[PDB]
Write a protein that binds this DNA or RNA. Sequence first.
RNA 1: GGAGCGGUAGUUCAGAGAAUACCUGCCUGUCACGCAGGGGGUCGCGGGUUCGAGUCCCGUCCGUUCCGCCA
RNA 2: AUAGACUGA
RNA 3: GGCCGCAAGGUUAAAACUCAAAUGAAUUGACGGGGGCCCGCACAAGCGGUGGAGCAUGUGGUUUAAUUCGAUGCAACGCGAAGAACCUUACCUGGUCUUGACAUCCACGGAAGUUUUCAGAGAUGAGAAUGUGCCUUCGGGAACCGUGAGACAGGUGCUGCAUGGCUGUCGUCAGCUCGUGUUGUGAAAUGUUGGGUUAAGUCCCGCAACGAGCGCAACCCUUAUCCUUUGUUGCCAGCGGUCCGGCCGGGAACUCAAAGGAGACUGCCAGUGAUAAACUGGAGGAAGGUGGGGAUGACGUCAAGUCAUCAUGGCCCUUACGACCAGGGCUACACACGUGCUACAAUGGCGCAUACAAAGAGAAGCGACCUCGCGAGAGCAAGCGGACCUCAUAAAGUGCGUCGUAGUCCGGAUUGGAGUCUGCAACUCGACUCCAUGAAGUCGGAAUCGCUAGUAAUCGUGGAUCAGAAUGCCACGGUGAAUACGU
RNA 4: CCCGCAGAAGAAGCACCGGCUAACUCCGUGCCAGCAGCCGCGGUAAUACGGAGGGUGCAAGCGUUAAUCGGAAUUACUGGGC
Lengths: 357, 206
Amino acid sequence: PVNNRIQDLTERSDVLRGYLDYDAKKERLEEVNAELEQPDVWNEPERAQALGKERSSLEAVVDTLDQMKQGLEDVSGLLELAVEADDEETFNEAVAELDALEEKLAQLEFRRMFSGEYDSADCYLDIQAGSGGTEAQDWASMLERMYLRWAESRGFKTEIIEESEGEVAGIKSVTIKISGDYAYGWLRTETGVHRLVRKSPFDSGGRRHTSFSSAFVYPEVDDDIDIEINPADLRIDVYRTSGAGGQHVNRTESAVRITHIPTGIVTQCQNDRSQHKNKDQAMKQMKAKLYELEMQKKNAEKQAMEDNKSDIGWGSQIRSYVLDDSRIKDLRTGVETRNTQAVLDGSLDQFIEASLK
Amino acid sequence: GQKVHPNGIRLGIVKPWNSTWFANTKEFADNLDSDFKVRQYLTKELAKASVSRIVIERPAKSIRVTIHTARPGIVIGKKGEDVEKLRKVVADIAGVPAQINIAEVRKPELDAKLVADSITSQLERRVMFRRAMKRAVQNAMRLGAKGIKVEVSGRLGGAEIARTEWYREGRVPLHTLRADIDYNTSEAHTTYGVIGVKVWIFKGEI
RNA sequence: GGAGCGGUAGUUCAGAGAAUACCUGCCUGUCACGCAGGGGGUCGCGGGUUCGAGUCCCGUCCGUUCCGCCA
RNA sequence: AUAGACUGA
RNA sequence: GGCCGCAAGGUUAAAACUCAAAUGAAUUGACGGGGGCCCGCACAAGCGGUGGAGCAUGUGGUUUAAUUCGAUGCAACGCGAAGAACCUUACCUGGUCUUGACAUCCACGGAAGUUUUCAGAGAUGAGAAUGUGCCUUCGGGAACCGUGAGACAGGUGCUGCAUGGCUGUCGUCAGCUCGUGUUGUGAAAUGUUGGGUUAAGUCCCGCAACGAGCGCAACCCUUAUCCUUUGUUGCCAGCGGUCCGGCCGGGAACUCAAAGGAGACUGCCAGUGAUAAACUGGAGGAAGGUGGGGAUGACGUCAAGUCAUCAUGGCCCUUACGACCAGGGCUACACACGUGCUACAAUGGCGCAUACAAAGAGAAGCGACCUCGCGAGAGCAAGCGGACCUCAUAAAGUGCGUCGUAGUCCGGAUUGGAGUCUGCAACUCGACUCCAUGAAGUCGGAAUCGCUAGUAAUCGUGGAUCAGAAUGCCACGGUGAAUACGU
RNA sequence: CCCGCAGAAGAAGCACCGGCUAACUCCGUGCCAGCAGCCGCGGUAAUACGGAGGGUGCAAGCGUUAAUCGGAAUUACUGGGC
Ligand SMILES: [Mg+2]
Ligand SMILES: [Mg+2]
Ligand SMILES: [Mg+2]
Ligand SMILES: [Mg+2]
Ligand SMILES: [Mg+2]
Ligand SMILES: [Mg+2]
Ligand SMILES: [Mg+2]
Ligand SMILES: [Mg+2]
Ligand SMILES: [Mg+2]
Ligand SMILES: [Mg+2]
Ligand SMILES: [Mg+2]
Ligand SMILES: [Mg+2]
Ligand SMILES: [Mg+2]
Ligand SMILES: [Mg+2]
Ligand SMILES: [Mg+2]
Ligand SMILES: [Mg+2]
Ligand SMILES: [Mg+2]
Ligand SMILES: [Mg+2]
Ligand SMILES: [Mg+2]
Ligand SMILES: [Mg+2]
Ligand SMILES: [Mg+2]
Ligand SMILES: [Mg+2]
Ligand SMILES: [Mg+2]
Ligand SMILES: [Mg+2]
Ligand SMILES: [Mg+2]
Ligand SMILES: [Mg+2]
Ligand SMILES: [Mg+2]
Ligand SMILES: [Mg+2]
Ligand SMILES: [Mg+2]
Ligand SMILES: [Mg+2]
Ligand SMILES: [Mg+2]
Ligand SMILES: [Mg+2]
């Protein structure tokens, strides 16, 4: 079976060679070496050092795959000298070398799935029923159950944040926190509307009906603003209290106005008779406004990603689940699985792997 | 709903058995299996011989097979060569000496098995189901049957939805136990599926 | 800034309870309603008195009020 | 005397 | 916009845009918290249960490497499964094979086979001996094993919303139709409606209808009475004798056994009724109005169930979605539901004594008698392919004694120890026996089920599956009620 | 316009085939791509989508769009209704 393991790693190396196109990376390296070999590259140090690091990045994949095939040949040769000569010592040594090759190959395998700052952040799944009514709610409940079971299989923690139970059956909307290593990276590609094609149990006539449920996965964010304002970035000016005392002959410089020098936001307080209390109130208001600015920065996605969220209805399907004919298919990846049962409870990684492309 | 088999419900009243032999519990199963093998062989070879039914009788250490057919000439063969060859194989299957006799089923139109086989053959040859059913009913009534009911079920005409059609003329009393109701079934393997044909023939009471 | 009122079941209110809420089992073709059986907080947070504290006392967050004026 | 509602192939 | 009006508003009066319909009369169904008339344990009157406890079993859920697949209101849930330790097995882990485990066919080598070692958990692999046979144009081969093809095998893989076949259900409900004639432009109507009457579209009468078919009834099985046969392995009235035991001699009476007939037909009498159909009674008769029970399930309804009995179009895999083997799983367990068994005791527990059944199975089987073991059973060994022998003491019941209202001399769950039987092998995961322990449970909330007479309730007995493994399924008898004013 | 020379030699495409309306099968797709004057077709066995074979109707033209009349007795004078 160890020879089968060698072939399996050979298959993994060969497909990883195709995916990462190390020959094309070497093709990129062809013109990388053109300017690096000649001394006429330090005129612009950005051209020199960046190419040097890019060359290392290209050769990282290229050389590892080269060492991968060479190592596989060495393991095959050692096992031929081991099993045929009954040398169990070399038989175990080649297994350890083969395991080391798998570790090197897995590094490049994980390299492709490495993407985004939130790649290791905990993911938050939101499932909302759409067209289909009660049947859509049931489909949403079936959708969240397999997501929870998939997360449990991966070992990720499950936390039901909120669920608004359906009026008749199922749940209208669920929000579940899935916490684990690279949880967002695993489930970031499960975003969209899923189509369910089955005979509706709620329909009296038993007609074949189509239902839709959404699945929005938003990553873990700081969700907190701890920005502290700077006295050097703030300008405070005192002036007469125009309100409630601006009429009298005797006016004091109790009114204050704090203007943020970088941003330009102006804040003024005239309620209290003491300039120090007015300064404190203006400081609270200005800091609160700055807090709002960072919140609006976070809210930029709440107006963009929410708009990008396609309607839960016809024509927005990302994956088709034909339970009547047992032909679950992901249109985006072109992957068809005949076993509906498995996809209904777990085994979603089969479509996830192709979705990582 | 569901209907009892006319032959089974009339087995002891107005119908004979297709297998008449006495055996204890030890050899009852062996005799039944041997009869099944003999019938399977004879039906396969004499499919083109228009065999209505086969009766297997087991005397002491012997098996006498009577084959009822509408075309005795082909079954008998030249100088009895065909029946002799059939007798040899039947004896080999049974394990005891065999004696094959041939009976003539005159008026082939008044036989449930023959009509059902003819209809299925026409359906396989893509003959219109209604034309086949009407012709079979008309022939039986012309010959002198007091009543005939023909039912054809399946994907008739290649339609994606199967349906059941039936034509009945005369009296076909299925609730009278003293009625000589001849009932038989057959199946036609068309290019779209399997089509079942059932024939009821009433030839009088008692 | 001064003087009071509070903070208790998921929520609203009493002093560890009530209503709503939530489970489970019934009824019904199914839901709702309805019937029956249950659980659910250890008193905003800390300290101190007390044999003994949700309670009494002090400090602190938290919300509610009124006042904060005359030149 | 009380008694409501059955999405969408 | 104009005119009118105190106002509310009235009068005249568009356009953009949108859809392929909107609408009237009539027809067939379906429905109504519309009407009239009826039926069914449907209510009403009763009896006994479930829902509370323990256990058995199935299901959902959860868990798991797998916990195989299917069945989901009535009409899924002691269901396919009339019986998972291996097998079954279709699932998982691991070790293996790849014209294959299973088929045809070509060529070549071989008889086929029968025994012994051999390494492996086993598959398998390496050997070693033994025979090397039979029909035989003695020319052949025939059969049965291997090798090498490659056309092909193989699938419990998907679709029951492509199908055949089979089945459930409304529902054994009484309805569903057709030919011709007639009416209406037509969908359609009539017949098939109406007065009775019936279990019934059962029958009579009327009628633009006349007839017919599938349905109802009858013909079929069984039971209740009698006659005729036949009298053994069954029976014992008259006897003969007898150990008193139908035990022999006997007998063909009777019970009984299985074949053929008789009998029940509103056939007869009274009364009502439209001089009809029928109904209410009565006589006789074993049986009176279908005497009881069963089989028999119309056109169709649910795209109802089954592609996993089987067959089957199409699609899918072919060094694997095929095949072999070992082990494990289907028996997992924070829970919920369904169907049952045992109880919560005195109409009873226990000890002793003593009566009354029916039906069925048995040859790789039923197993007598005797001996041994407290017991499950063990040894020996008759009879029976059976009205003969065995399974095979029926229990409830009756008599006596005791317990004396207590979680008990109720209840027997659970657990410890020791054994028997089948089976290669009872760890996961069989049944049973002996000693020991002795749980909940003291009659069960909302709610819910079955039953109209030899029925309910209760008591035992047998069979299919099956080497072993029933509280389930199927059948057999023993005691044996209460109630039905009525719609 | 006529007479000679040479050689079949230099010369056929467009729309459509579910019904209206003449002309049918296979393959690919799977409520997607798309078609569409109206009814509508496509959700794994499509004569309606795309391609191929065959066929139909026109032809140096063939289809689509725009505009008028007709069908429209659907402004009814011929010739309608409350
Ligand atoms: Mg509403
Ligand atoms: Mg106006
Ligand atoms: Mg009642
Ligand atoms: Mg219970
Ligand atoms: Mg199951
Ligand atoms: Mg299946
Ligand atoms: Mg097993
Ligand atoms: Mg096994
Ligand atoms: Mg079906
Ligand atoms: Mg007419
Ligand atoms: Mg009628
Ligand atoms: Mg009728
Ligand atoms: Mg009438
Ligand atoms: Mg009739
Ligand atoms: Mg009449
Ligand atoms: Mg009488
Ligand atoms: Mg009948
Ligand atoms: Mg179905
Ligand atoms: Mg199904
Ligand atoms: Mg099971
Ligand atoms: Mg067990
Ligand atoms: Mg017997
Ligand atoms: Mg006891
Ligand atoms: Mg107790
Ligand atoms: Mg009754
Ligand atoms: Mg038995
Ligand atoms: Mg058994
Ligand atoms: Mg009984
Ligand atoms: Mg045409
Ligand atoms: Mg196609
Ligand atoms: Mg005009
Ligand atoms: Mg008009």
